[PDB]
Amino acid sequence: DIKPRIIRFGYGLADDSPTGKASAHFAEVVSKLSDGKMKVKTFGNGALGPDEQLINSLISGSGEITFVSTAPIASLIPEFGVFDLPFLFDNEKVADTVLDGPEGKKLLDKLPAKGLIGLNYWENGFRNITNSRHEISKLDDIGGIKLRVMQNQVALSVFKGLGANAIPMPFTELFTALETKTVDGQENPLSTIQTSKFYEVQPYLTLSNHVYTPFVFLASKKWFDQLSQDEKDVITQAAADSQAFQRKASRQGNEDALKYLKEHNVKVAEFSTEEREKIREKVAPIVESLKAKIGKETVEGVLDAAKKAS
Ligand SMILES: O=C(O)[C@H](O)[C@H](O)[C@H](O)[C@@H](O)CO
Numbered sequence: 662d663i664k665p666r667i668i669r670f671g672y673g674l675a676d677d678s679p680t681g682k683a684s685a686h687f688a689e690v691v692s693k694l695s696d697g698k699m700k701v702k703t704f705g706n707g708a709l710g711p712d713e714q715l716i717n718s719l720i721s722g723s724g725e726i727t728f729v730s731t732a733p734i735a736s737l738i739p740e741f742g743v744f745d746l747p748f749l750f751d752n753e754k755v756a757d758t759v760l761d762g763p764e765g766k767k768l769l770d771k772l773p774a775k776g777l778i779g780l781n782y783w784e785n786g787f788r789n790i791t792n793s794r795h796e797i798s799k800l801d802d803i804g805g806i807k808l809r810v811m812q813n814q815v816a817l818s819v820f821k822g823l824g825a826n827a828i829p830m831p832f833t834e835l836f837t838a839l840e841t842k843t844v845d846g847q848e849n850p851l852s853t854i855q856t857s858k859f860y861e862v863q864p865y866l867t868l869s870n871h872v873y874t875p876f877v878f879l880a881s882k883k884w885f886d887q888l889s890q891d892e893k894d895v896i897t898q899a900a901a902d903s904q905a906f907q908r909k910a911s912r913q914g915n916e917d918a919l920k921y922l923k924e925h926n927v928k929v930a931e932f933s934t935e936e937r938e939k940i941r942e943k944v945a946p947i948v949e950s951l952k953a954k955i956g957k958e959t960v961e962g963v964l965d966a967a968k969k970a971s
Contacts, residue, residue: 662889668701670726671709671718673832678856679914680728680783680876681705683907687726690899699895701726711831713812719881720776726896728876730785732811738771740959745815746951747944749963750873751971753784753912758970760875764962769877778880780900784911785874791854791863792846793839798867798930800824800939807845809835815951819872822947823940839863848872851918852911860922866929868919871940878904 670688674681681703688701709715709724712733718724735742743749750756759765760782769779790797792806804824810816812829820827828844838844840862847859848871854860878900885893923929932940952960 662891663695663698663895664889664892665698666700666888666892668699668725669704669709669723670701671704671715671724672727673707673711673715673729674705674853675856676703676705678705679852679910680785680907681856683783683903683910684728686906687899687903690902691895694895694898695892699892707833711833713831716777716879719879720883722881722883725881725884726879728783728878730811730874730876732813732816732874734772734877735813735815735955737775738768739954740768740771740956742813742815742951742955743768743959743963744875745811745813745819745872746948746955746960747819747871748941750967753786753873753908755967755970756784756873756875757908759963759966762966762970764959764966765875767962768959772877772879773882776882778882778885780878780880780897781904783876783878783904783907785876786850786852786911786915787870788848788850788872788874789854790846790848790867790869790871791839791859792865793842793863794845794865796865796867796928796930797869798932799936800932800943807843809838809844809847814954818947818951819944823943835859836862850874850911850915851922852914855918855921860925860927864928866922866927868929868931 670684672684684703688703691699691701712729715727715729719727731741731744765782772779797803806825808820808825808827809830810820810827817827817829835847839859
């Protein structure tokens with residue numbers, strides 16, 4: 662029961678990013694599993710707008726598939742704000758375990774009420790601080806830095822508490838704001854810093870790995886529900902295949918990215934063990950207040966699953 666369909670897949674990152682190549686890989690798998698009847702068209706690099714617009718496109722049905730960071734979803738479902746808390750996951754293996762486990766599914770299950778199907782989680786990654794004003798190797802260096810953040814009360818509160826002037830902006834506007842120094846800097850994973858070319862206008866990189874961002878791989882519930890079960894099965898099966906492809910490609914891209922940023926002579930700093938301690942204690946009281954905005958059951962449950970995974 663598989664009829665010809667044309668399926669629109671917009672996203673924010675560059676086509677050459679690991680997740681952009683995973684998007685093409687998803688397109689290829691969907692076609693294979695449907696004998697060429699289901700054809701995914703990808704529109705990368707923000708061609709169909711930033712995350713916030715992609716989410717709305719899926720709700721309304723102008724788009725079929727996207728991947729977005731969890732932060733913008735907090736505007737619909739506050740519990741998704743949990744992943745903007747710093748230092749939640751020690752490594753990617755903890756993240757996978759938690760996201761693919763009951764605490765991750767509890768959140769994905771909140772999406773149909775809002776018109777969305779969370780097919781699964783993909784990896785955006787550990788985020789690192791880039792700027793153009795000065796090296797950031799100490800908590801103190803963050804003070805008064807005009808830092809773009811993702812558009813969520815949790816991101817804004819955390820970085821304001823670390824002393825920065827936190828400027829929420831959509832990702833599609835970020836490059837020009839860095840280039841024009843309307844903002845001093847930003848924080849993203851290395852392979853995004855590379856493939857969106859932020860390093861061209863950001864001479865400083867700090868390997869802070871301060872937050873882990875999941876992507877949600879999403880379908881429009883309106884569109885998905887009118888598929889036949891055989892058609893749904895092509896999508897979910899392709900999504901499981903692409904999740905594994907995406908996570909491997911993300912991790913390898915993270916390694917290639919640091920080399921390219923290094924071998925390209927970007928100035929890379931780290932936070933000391935001590936400075937990282939200072940960071941955690943500055944954020945502690947703010948994380949505690951944000952629980953009320955996120956959802957105390959979600960924060961505590963994610964922390965407990967992270968602990969057992971770890
Ligand atoms: O900095 C951000 O907003 C995010 O890390 C990503 O750029 C964003 O989730 C997506 O647009 C990526 O496709």
